[PDB]
Amino acid sequence: MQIYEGKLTAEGLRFGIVASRFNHALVDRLVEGAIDCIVRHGGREEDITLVRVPGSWEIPVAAGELARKEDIDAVIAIGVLIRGATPHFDYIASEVSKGLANLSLELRKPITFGVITADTLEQAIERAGTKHGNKGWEAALSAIEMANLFKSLR
Amino acid sequence: MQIYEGKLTAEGLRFGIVASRFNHALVDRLVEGAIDCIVRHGGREEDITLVRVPGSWEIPVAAGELARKEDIDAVIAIGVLIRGATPHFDYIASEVSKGLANLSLELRKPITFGVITADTLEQAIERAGTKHGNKGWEAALSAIEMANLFKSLR
Amino acid sequence: MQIYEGKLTAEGLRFGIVASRFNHALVDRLVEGAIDCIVRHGGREEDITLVRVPGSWEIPVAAGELARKEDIDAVIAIGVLIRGATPHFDYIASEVSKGLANLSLELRKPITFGVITADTLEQAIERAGTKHGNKGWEAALSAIEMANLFKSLR
Amino acid sequence: MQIYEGKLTAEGLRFGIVASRFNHALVDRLVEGAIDCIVRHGGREEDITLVRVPGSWEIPVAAGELARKEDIDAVIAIGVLIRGATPHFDYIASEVSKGLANLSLELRKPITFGVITADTLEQAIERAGTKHGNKGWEAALSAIEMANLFKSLR
């Protein structure tokens, strides 16, 4: 059988991170976790490009610029959405996830989903470096794997 | 009437399988079922390409690379999503299904959906080689049929 | 006012029918109804092309091949989805409807929706040749009208 | 500041109306409303093109043909969907709205949404020329404004 897979060593890999600023007390923990994952898997901090945008709505259009760079191997999208009183959350979460997924297919380049979409603040806290882990660290680990996979698959 | 259909013998057919790693104790049973269905329908194991990706989110972008290969007749997407506490599942399930369906139409090549989308762990276990069958085996059987069909349709 | 409309006589019209095999005891009644509608409206059975696929998921990619044929005036998509225990139904029904609607716009050719999307088995039986009619007959009648319409509109 | 807006006089404007036939006792009041709004705003009835299609599902593909005409300034989509027993309504309403919205962007031409999407028959009756007005008349007024706006914006 032909088997393709990505290892988890990040030597020589170059990452773009797009991180929104809303809910920054939680997004900043996700960014810390993504950078930590990259660096302790052997990626250099100098080969990370960090783009900041105001809210999760603006993540896609910035990720589309970063993922078009030839010297970016994968993009990690980071943000925190917490449901408020209206259906606003539904439309933002829907379009942020659709836009990143579409951009990954269009550009044929891994874009990983480090965006929390929580009903409650407690759930967001749990996923931003407390009892359910750190979704930024997880999205960066996925991006390492996918960049390594794409060195033979793409 | 002109009637087009695919038979279920897999001699000479070449398959791509993209299988995510999350929930691997269940995904691995789906992969076993897909390979068994191919091989005991006459397909050779050497004509299977298996691509591993970290999560269901990353299945589409890998399936788009595999489906673009001229020597792949059909792609079988395999993964297991189980709803958690937040709406995350909804956005991942929505984009994985949308991306695979879109890629199948864009590339005019059968891509079959062996991805469980369960509300509970019990429902995923049921569909991964226990009391409700094996969705990997089912998605491979669909891909056999579709690849045969496309020998005259495409 | 300029008024465009399609009549319901099917002389000289050529139809493609894509029908899935899952829930075949019901889909086969929808296929009977579509062929009967075409033939008793004056269409010839020789000018029907029937393509079988395993499940509703595979309808779109087969319909995209049939709709691209220059000698097919309209495509009728036929299948039966019944909700199960998990959200699987939602993702399949969503992508089958999206893919067919998208193909119709991309290819500028009528593709009619004879796909039952039922919560219960009883509702599917009602719509497959019993007390609420036959959705295959209805989708064929719509395709007759739209093909005649497009003789002047397209 | 530069300010662009459309007035509501319809002299010289040319409209396409696509109206489905299902629920025709209500759709026909919406069509009456749209024509009345155009004509009493100064538009000529001869400058209306009316296309009939069988159901709301078929509105998009017909609107795509009408909106491509160089001599059509805006398209008004008219139809009535009323929820039935199954989830069918959800998929039809979803793709009709998606397809019109997408066509408007692709063709860079206003397409207005005079499609009722009601849970009950009572709600549809209210919106088709009774206590909550006439959605046909409203979609026509929007299309007059948009066609005038696009004489300077487009």
Add this chain to the structure above:
Amino acid sequence: MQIYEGKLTAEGLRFGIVASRFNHALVDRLVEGAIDCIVRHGGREEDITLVRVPGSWEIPVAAGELARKEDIDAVIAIGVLIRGATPHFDYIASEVSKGLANLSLELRKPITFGVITADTLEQAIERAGTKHGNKGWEAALSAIEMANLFKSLR
């Protein structure tokens, strides 16, 4: 086996329609439906004879005159009965259905039943061109089939 059936093309067929005036806001949609079905199946509008009578009670005696015409191939009976406070409805619906059924047998000529017999106003509205279709259109389609059938059977 000898098989007799009628097709649904209406070329050269000549219809009588008897339509009562009570509940005319609904009956008039049934009449619209019957004429539309005839005409778009290929029947000429000039070959329709429309007789108006005051109530459903008077439909039979008028249908008896129309069905005796040698140049009428089938009669379509159209009316709307809605149950009131007394048992009146029962006696009217009973004799209207009995009288049409008896006339069809006595005159050996198809007479189709496009008469709504509803418990509620809502039910009548549903059946006169809204969510349960148009009983006029249905009774016309039956009369087209029956007139064609009788060209070989009678």
Add this chain to the structure above:
Amino acid sequence: MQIYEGKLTAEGLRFGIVASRFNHALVDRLVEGAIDCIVRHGGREEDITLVRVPGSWEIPVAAGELARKEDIDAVIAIGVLIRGATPHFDYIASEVSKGLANLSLELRKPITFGVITADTLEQAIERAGTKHGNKGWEAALSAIEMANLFKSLR
């Protein structure tokens, strides 16, 4: 289309009225209403023939004599049934309506149904010249229309 209808002017028309005597305090108001309708629509009182019978049961056999007269253009049947304690009402109401409907078809002559069939005395009072109108006036108006119709239809 050929269109047959009756106007509501009664000049030269000749009517037979058969009215029972039971519940005469109510039937006599129905008779007043029928004569008033005829006369103020231009019919002459001299061209009315009134036949009295004891009960609603006897209306049909008397109406069959009046309808056979060559110089009677239409017959109006008038009576009031009110449900009692036993099923008697059901059998009388059933046979009176059946007999009148049958005679109209046999004799090919309009016979209109001005017979109240009420569950309560209050419902009969409502329909005999109070809050729900006068069923004798209504049956006479129907007979005027049908006699004028039959001048061209019969």
Add this chain to the structure above:
Amino acid sequence: MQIYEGKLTAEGLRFGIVASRFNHALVDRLVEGAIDCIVRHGGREEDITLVRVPGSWEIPVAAGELARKEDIDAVIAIGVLIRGATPHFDYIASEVSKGLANLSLELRKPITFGVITADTLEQAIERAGTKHGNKGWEAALSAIEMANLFKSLR
């Protein structure tokens, strides 16, 4: 038949608007809506006369002065009443509506009713440029139609 109607183009039309000041946060949205409706239907802002009065009670006497002007084609009355704790609202709403209706008849000149009469503050907000529209815009549209009508009717 002779048919008189007003179109909705406002070229050359001259309007008087009488608007009270109580509940001005809402009345001022109604005034914006009336002026916008006039101007975007082709009326000139220079041909509007606006009269301010303290409360709805004072609208009639000011409207009677404006309606008597030979160069005013129609008057639009604008104000917002919201029920308070006492029956005061009833007497004010009753006399404002009576006075305007009476003046319109006495002076034979259209006076349109853009006065909200609400039980609650929420209902007034809904009708002053939010979810149930803008009653000032609606009263202006009615005044445009009636002024055009009276060019031939008066």
